[PDB]
Amino acid sequence: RSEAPPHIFSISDNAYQYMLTDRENQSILITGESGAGKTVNTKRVIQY
Amino acid sequence: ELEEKMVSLLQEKNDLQLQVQAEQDNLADAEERCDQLIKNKIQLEAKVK
Amino acid sequence: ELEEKMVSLLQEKNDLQLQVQAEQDNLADAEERCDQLIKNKIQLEAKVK
Amino acid sequence: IEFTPEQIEEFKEAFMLFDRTPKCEMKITYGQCGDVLRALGQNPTQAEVLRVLGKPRQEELNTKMMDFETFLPMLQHISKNKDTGTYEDFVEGLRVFDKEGNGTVMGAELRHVLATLGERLTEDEVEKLMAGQEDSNGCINYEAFVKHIMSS
Amino acid sequence: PAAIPEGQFIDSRKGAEKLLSSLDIDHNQYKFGHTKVFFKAGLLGLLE
Amino acid sequence: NKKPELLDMLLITNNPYDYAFISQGETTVASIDDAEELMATDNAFDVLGFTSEEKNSMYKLTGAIMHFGNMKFKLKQREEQAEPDGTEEADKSAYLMGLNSADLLKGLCHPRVKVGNEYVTKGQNVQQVIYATGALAKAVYERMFNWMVTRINATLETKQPRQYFIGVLDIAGFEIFDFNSFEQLCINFTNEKLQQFFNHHMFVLEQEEYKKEGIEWTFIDFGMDLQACIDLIEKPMGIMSILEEECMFPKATDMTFKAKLFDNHLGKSANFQKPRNIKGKPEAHFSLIHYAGIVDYNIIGWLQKNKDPLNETVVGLYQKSSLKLLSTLFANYAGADAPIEKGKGKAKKGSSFQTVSALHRENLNKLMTNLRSTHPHFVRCIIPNETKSPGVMDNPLVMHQLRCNGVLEGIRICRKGFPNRILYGDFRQRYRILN
Amino acid sequence: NWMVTRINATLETKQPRQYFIGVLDIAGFEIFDFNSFEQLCINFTNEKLQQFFNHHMFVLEQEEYKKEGIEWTFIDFGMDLQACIDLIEKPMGIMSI
């Protein structure tokens, strides 16, 4: 987390290794009213 | 050193046969203890009828 | 030449062991078969009483 | 601190063999400066040789030749140094490569890392180093392995 | 390894403070209680 | 006996009476030390051919079972989910293991719970964890000793001759204290049958052996029997009992265990002795006609003693451990491959942490049937006093005991019973020209 | 649904195993006249999910804090939405009728 500037890719990798260390399974939720950019990210999340 | 090894085989042959008996009896006893269940099962289903 | 005979003694050992292990699989499949009957008892007991 | 008479002779006994020339040169190459220290029973990094060489192009044979009159001072220099790497500096490094502190590390994992990190090795230096103790599992025991590297 | 000798703690707290002090941290970025330590952003991920 | 160096690495208290798993206090033994006996046996390891690592390794794994009892959970009544007040207590465990220190101190209290098939989390309430940690240390010990014997037989296998044997039966039990539980039951349930083999061997198998050999003998016997009471063959032992055919159902209690004994065994079978009114709201006691004494067993607690549950995760994370010897103690293979159908175990069979009493069925068949086919040699050792005192004897005790070990009837047959026995071909060839 | 069946049938190559993750993907705040069985599902979730933030981000961390027995005065932030998820008087209510 404390290597990279704010971008989705590290939002992933941070949680990944945490799960691999502390055993905690985890679930991301995106939030915004109706007009943000939610699913627009999620397509890129899947690909990443 | 080969001869020293071989001699264990006539013996292990007798070793195995005794176990072949004992676990065949163990199988038989287990089959009986299954047979009592299979045979009483007809009674269990009959009583439910 | 007794090398072949060494293995031949081992072959009686192969089958005596292959038989027994298969009789462990005999009792092995019977492991699900046996306990399944013990469970089938308990439910049917509760169906009856 | 100086260099005893036993130290002089050992340096020479090798130097004569090293300098392979029909005519003189009473000199080695700044590359041979490395492997000489190794053969002498010293263990410097290439970076240690680059720390003490005035050749920022390392590595290559054909720039500056050195006499023993330049080698022996450098040997007196190496003899002073502590930062070479102990068993302790290695026992540190090994303790991430065991996926569960046993000593027994995976050969394939050891390969990937040696090629990528530190100084980096060549294909050959990898393949050559792992020719034992490889068992039917593939468990190189990192500690006894290091003790051998210390041994020679 | 040189941070804690034979018998630093004793009080598991007191010898943790010795080792963490040797590694130049204060007990506030990560907090202590009784059983546990609390880590903020990066702190644990800096120990790594 | 351990030196100041090992004291660090091994993580012993310098001071005594710190150790929590040592109840009562530091009790002594008459005439031995504790200290010098260490150096003797440690050398006995060197003599076994242990590696210089494994010396420390076996001690590493063994010593933690002292360390574990120190983890002092404390009531913080806002939920009752206690976390223990310290770390040193469990660290002296962790290091000796080389298990992920974070995995330890977290997972103990908050493990991943298998719910049906999926995964959930939970904090365990105080007492749940306290006992569940105590489970962990005793979980290591049962496993380690079973690993120890198997690894020790390894150094002593008959390195390629004709495996021919004698069998010596050494089962240490039949101890009479106010406390007898399921532990005492599983042990004394072998000692019962050994005493039965005395009947089966002194009367019977002695002269059965004579019968086979075909000697000048005459069959004689007396009615000293136990069988209409104590199961002999594996199957009777593997039908025995309510802690067999019902040990998996949520409604069974140690109360009902005594009751179903009382239905099936009582009245008609004269060998069974019933409690003196601890029934109904009970400690639950019973007794049976065991030759050497009427043992008072207590039933409450047998469920958990025959279920033996612990925290999953923390042992599962021990599987992913270090120090070689620490690790091996954890998994399957066991030199065999078979499906796990549960109530147990692995073989036999699949999983419920334990069901050891079923595992004590399998091996029971394998020991016994072979033991019938082996020549009996026997020594019937009697006890002179309760007081643990050398040389002293009591009459009231010995009075009873000589009446109880079938010694009378035992001399009535074994008065002609030959204690010397060799080979006739030899004795004939060796005497030859005397005449 | 034919696809949802078909795809999990084809893209699930390891039944009964963990671990597992997930991503929550839903719309936002919208309004429409014809309230029948359908539309109520959306705004209710945007609400409850805001509450999923509130509870996790302010409260849950504290539920363990209060128990630890550390010098920590609790911090309320006055963001609650509990009183809409189920009926106060009788559980479910509408569904049962």
Tab-separated table of N, CA, C and O in Angstrom, chain F residues 41-82:
chain	number	residue	atom	x	y	z
F	41	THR	N	19.920	-39.795	30.015
F	41	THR	CA	18.998	-40.131	28.913
F	41	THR	C	19.353	-39.386	27.630
F	41	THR	O	19.340	-39.977	26.560
F	42	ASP	N	19.756	-38.124	27.750
F	42	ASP	CA	20.197	-37.329	26.590
F	42	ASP	C	21.346	-38.032	25.854
F	42	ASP	O	21.388	-38.025	24.628
F	43	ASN	N	22.231	-38.654	26.627
F	43	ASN	CA	23.318	-39.466	26.060
F	43	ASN	C	22.746	-40.723	25.391
F	43	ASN	O	23.219	-41.134	24.337
F	44	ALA	N	21.683	-41.255	25.992
F	44	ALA	CA	20.883	-42.358	25.440
F	44	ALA	C	20.277	-42.054	24.055
F	44	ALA	O	19.962	-42.905	23.226
F	45	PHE	N	20.063	-40.784	23.803
F	45	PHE	CA	19.682	-40.324	22.460
F	45	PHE	C	20.869	-40.395	21.503
F	45	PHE	O	20.761	-40.952	20.411
F	46	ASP	N	22.010	-39.872	21.955
F	46	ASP	CA	23.265	-39.964	21.180
F	46	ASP	C	23.558	-41.429	20.847
F	46	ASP	O	23.807	-41.776	19.697
F	47	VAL	N	23.353	-42.273	21.853
F	47	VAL	CA	23.513	-43.724	21.696
F	47	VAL	C	22.494	-44.327	20.718
F	47	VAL	O	22.799	-45.325	20.077
F	48	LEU	N	21.303	-43.739	20.626
F	48	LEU	CA	20.314	-44.167	19.621
F	48	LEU	C	20.744	-43.832	18.193
F	48	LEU	O	20.416	-44.547	17.251
F	49	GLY	N	21.478	-42.725	18.077
F	49	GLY	CA	22.030	-42.281	16.787
F	49	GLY	C	21.274	-41.059	16.257
F	49	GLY	O	21.227	-40.823	15.052
F	50	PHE	N	20.655	-40.325	17.180
F	50	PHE	CA	20.007	-39.041	16.877
F	50	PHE	C	21.024	-38.038	16.333
F	50	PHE	O	22.197	-38.038	16.702
F	51	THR	N	20.535	-37.217	15.418
F	51	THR	CA	21.332	-36.108	14.872
F	51	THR	C	21.395	-34.979	15.911
F	51	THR	O	20.504	-34.830	16.753
F	52	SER	N	22.421	-34.146	15.774
F	52	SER	CA	22.699	-33.062	16.739
F	52	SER	C	21.561	-32.029	16.784
F	52	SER	O	21.338	-31.345	17.777
F	53	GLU	N	20.856	-31.915	15.666
F	53	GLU	CA	19.661	-31.068	15.529
F	53	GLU	C	18.532	-31.691	16.351
F	53	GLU	O	18.094	-31.129	17.349
F	54	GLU	N	18.219	-32.936	15.990
F	54	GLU	CA	17.050	-33.666	16.508
F	54	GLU	C	17.032	-33.791	18.028
F	54	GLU	O	15.956	-33.872	18.612
F	55	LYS	N	18.218	-33.757	18.629
F	55	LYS	CA	18.370	-33.687	20.094
F	55	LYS	C	17.514	-32.538	20.649
F	55	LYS	O	16.537	-32.749	21.360
F	56	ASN	N	17.818	-31.340	20.159
F	56	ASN	CA	17.102	-30.115	20.522
F	56	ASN	C	15.668	-30.105	19.976
F	56	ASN	O	14.768	-29.644	20.665
F	57	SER	N	15.453	-30.738	18.828
F	57	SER	CA	14.152	-30.704	18.134
F	57	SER	C	13.045	-31.417	18.906
F	57	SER	O	11.956	-30.882	19.100
F	58	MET	N	13.341	-32.633	19.343
F	58	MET	CA	12.380	-33.405	20.139
F	58	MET	C	12.070	-32.741	21.487
F	58	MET	O	10.921	-32.720	21.911
F	59	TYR	N	13.086	-32.129	22.094
F	59	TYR	CA	12.900	-31.365	23.339
F	59	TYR	C	12.082	-30.099	23.085
F	59	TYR	O	11.185	-29.784	23.865
F	60	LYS	N	12.328	-29.468	21.937
F	60	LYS	CA	11.585	-28.267	21.510
F	60	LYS	C	10.081	-28.530	21.478
F	60	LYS	O	9.294	-27.792	22.069
F	61	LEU	N	9.713	-29.594	20.771
F	61	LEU	CA	8.300	-29.933	20.627
F	61	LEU	C	7.681	-30.416	21.942
F	61	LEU	O	6.536	-30.085	22.253
F	62	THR	N	8.457	-31.189	22.693
F	62	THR	CA	7.991	-31.760	23.961
F	62	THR	C	7.755	-30.668	25.002
F	62	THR	O	6.771	-30.707	25.689
F	63	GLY	N	8.651	-29.703	25.139
F	63	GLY	CA	8.619	-28.700	26.226
F	63	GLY	C	7.488	-27.666	26.169
F	63	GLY	O	7.191	-27.005	27.166
F	64	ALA	N	6.884	-27.500	24.997
F	64	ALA	CA	5.870	-26.458	24.819
F	64	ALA	C	4.638	-26.787	25.660
F	64	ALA	O	4.040	-25.892	26.239
F	65	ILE	N	4.349	-28.079	25.788
F	65	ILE	CA	3.242	-28.611	26.604
F	65	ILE	C	3.316	-28.224	28.073
F	65	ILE	O	2.435	-28.613	28.817
F	66	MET	N	4.461	-27.723	28.512
F	66	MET	CA	4.542	-27.023	29.806
F	66	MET	C	4.138	-25.553	29.642
F	66	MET	O	3.272	-25.049	30.356
F	67	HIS	N	4.700	-24.938	28.606
F	67	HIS	CA	4.492	-23.519	28.261
F	67	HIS	C	3.042	-23.080	28.029
F	67	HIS	O	2.671	-21.964	28.385
F	68	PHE	N	2.224	-23.961	27.456
F	68	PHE	CA	0.874	-23.578	26.996
F	68	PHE	C	-0.103	-23.174	28.104
F	68	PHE	O	-0.891	-22.243	27.928
F	69	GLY	N	0.040	-23.831	29.263
F	69	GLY	CA	-0.872	-23.631	30.405
F	69	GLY	C	-0.846	-22.216	30.991
F	69	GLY	O	-1.673	-21.875	31.830
F	70	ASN	N	0.177	-21.454	30.616
F	70	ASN	CA	0.380	-20.096	31.139
F	70	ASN	C	-0.598	-19.053	30.592
F	70	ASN	O	-0.779	-18.013	31.223
F	71	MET	N	-1.149	-19.304	29.404
F	71	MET	CA	-2.053	-18.347	28.733
F	71	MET	C	-3.305	-18.056	29.575
F	71	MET	O	-4.329	-18.731	29.474
F	72	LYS	N	-3.219	-16.965	30.331
F	72	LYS	CA	-4.241	-16.600	31.324
F	72	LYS	C	-5.285	-15.642	30.737
F	72	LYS	O	-5.104	-14.420	30.714
F	73	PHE	N	-6.339	-16.236	30.187
F	73	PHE	CA	-7.537	-15.477	29.782
F	73	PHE	C	-8.201	-14.835	31.007
F	73	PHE	O	-8.187	-15.391	32.104
F	74	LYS	N	-8.766	-13.658	30.777
F	74	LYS	CA	-9.369	-12.834	31.839
F	74	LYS	C	-10.757	-12.349	31.409
F	74	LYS	O	-10.971	-12.009	30.243
F	75	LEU	N	-11.693	-12.376	32.351
F	75	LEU	CA	-13.067	-11.918	32.088
F	75	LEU	C	-13.105	-10.397	31.871
F	75	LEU	O	-12.817	-9.610	32.772
F	76	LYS	N	-13.586	-10.041	30.687
F	76	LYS	CA	-13.895	-8.650	30.309
F	76	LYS	C	-15.354	-8.634	29.838
F	76	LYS	O	-15.656	-8.788	28.653
F	77	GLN	N	-16.254	-8.570	30.818
F	77	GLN	CA	-17.699	-8.798	30.611
F	77	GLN	C	-18.410	-7.691	29.816
F	77	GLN	O	-19.199	-6.904	30.321
F	78	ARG	N	-18.213	-7.714	28.517
F	78	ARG	CA	-18.958	-6.842	27.592
F	78	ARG	C	-19.503	-7.672	26.433
F	78	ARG	O	-19.983	-7.137	25.440
F	79	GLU	N	-19.471	-8.992	26.626
F	79	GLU	CA	-19.644	-9.987	25.551
F	79	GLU	C	-19.148	-11.355	26.032
F	79	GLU	O	-19.621	-12.386	25.565
F	80	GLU	N	-18.142	-11.302	26.911
F	80	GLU	CA	-17.417	-12.464	27.460
F	80	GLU	C	-16.357	-13.053	26.520
F	80	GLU	O	-15.718	-14.037	26.877
F	81	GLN	N	-16.158	-12.446	25.353
F	81	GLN	CA	-15.059	-12.843	24.450
F	81	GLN	C	-13.712	-12.355	24.993
F	81	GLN	O	-13.335	-11.196	24.822
F	82	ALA	N	-13.089	-13.212	25.790
F	82	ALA	CA	-11.786	-12.896	26.389
F	82	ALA	C	-10.630	-13.135	25.415
F	82	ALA	O	-10.612	-14.092	24.643
